Design a protein around this ligand. Structure first.
Ligand SMILES: O[C@@H]1[C@@H](O)[C@@H](O)OC[C@H]1O
Ligand SMILES: O[C@@H]1[C@@H](O)[C@H](O)OC[C@H]1O
Ligand SMILES: [Ca+2]
Length: 223
């Protein structure tokens, strides 16, 4: 997260860190046994880390649970990042409490202009590299489809939306991928891609979760 703020420990209780020896992506807890992330975060050997703030210090609210199964969206295209979504099942159910909690799936898509909360442990610099240890937050609006498509000609599908600031300076970034975009208490986006980070006229591009609720629900019901 570039241009954001320190969330505060466990203030984003659905935020998960995906760990393969090191943090490499975010994700979102959607029930006690399932995490939503970006398909481009797929790898083998994922441990899901819940209840994290400082990802380099054991502070006392962590739950570390290995993944039992990963399901990349059937139509994920790694070249275009269309359908950049995957589901991760935990080997055991997380213990849900105030600091570790699921986030609701949307019942409708969010409109341009809605303000959302974006969070992650990604890079905090737009020209340079500094990875934070504690969770960073950014409040950002969803952008219009016309400004999104004009920022990224030929690249925005119906499964994507832009959020952020066309002036630059505030964005998600590398290491935030897979994490949440939450708007009015619903998971509306997944951190997916962008050109650099926090660049002028290059806002963040997010997986449009509302398009996937039927796939998410049926997948969970059968796995
Ligand atoms: O985002 C672009 C993607 O849509 C495709 O065109 O491959 C090149 C990328 O820059
Ligand atoms: O019990 C585990 C604890 O040892 C670790 O510190 O955080 C994750 C928990 O699952
Ligand atoms: Ca920790």
């Amino acid at each position: 997260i570039v241009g954001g703020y320190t969330c505060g420990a466990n203030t984003v209780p659905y935020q998960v860190s995906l760990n393969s020896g090191y943090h490499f992506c975010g994700g979102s807890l959607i029930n006690s046994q399932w995490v939503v992330s970006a398909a481009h975060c797929y790898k083998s050997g994922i441990q899901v880390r819940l209840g994290e703030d400082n990802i380099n210090v054991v502070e006392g609210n962590e739950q570390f649970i290995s993944a039992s199964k990963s399901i990349v969206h059937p139509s994920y295209n790694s070249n275009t990042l269309n359908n950049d979504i995957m589901l991760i099942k935990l080997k055991s159910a997380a213990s849900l409490n105030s600091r570790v909690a699921s986030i609701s799936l949307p019942t409708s898509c969010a409109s341009a202009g809605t303000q959302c909360l974006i969070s992650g442990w990604g890079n905090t610099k737009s020209s340079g590299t500094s990875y934070p240890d504690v969770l960073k937050c950014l409040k950002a609006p969803i952008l219009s489809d016309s400004s999104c498509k004009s920022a990224y000609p030929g690249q925005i599908t119906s499964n994507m939306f832009c959020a952020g600031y066309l002036e630059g300076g505030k964005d998600s970034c590398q290491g935030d991928s897979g994490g949440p975009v939450v708007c009015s208490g619903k998971l509306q986006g997944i951190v997916s891609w962008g050109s650099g980070c926090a660049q002028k006229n290059k806002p963040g591009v997010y997986t449009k979760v509302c398009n996937y609720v039927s796939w998410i629900k049926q997948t969970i019901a059968s796995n």
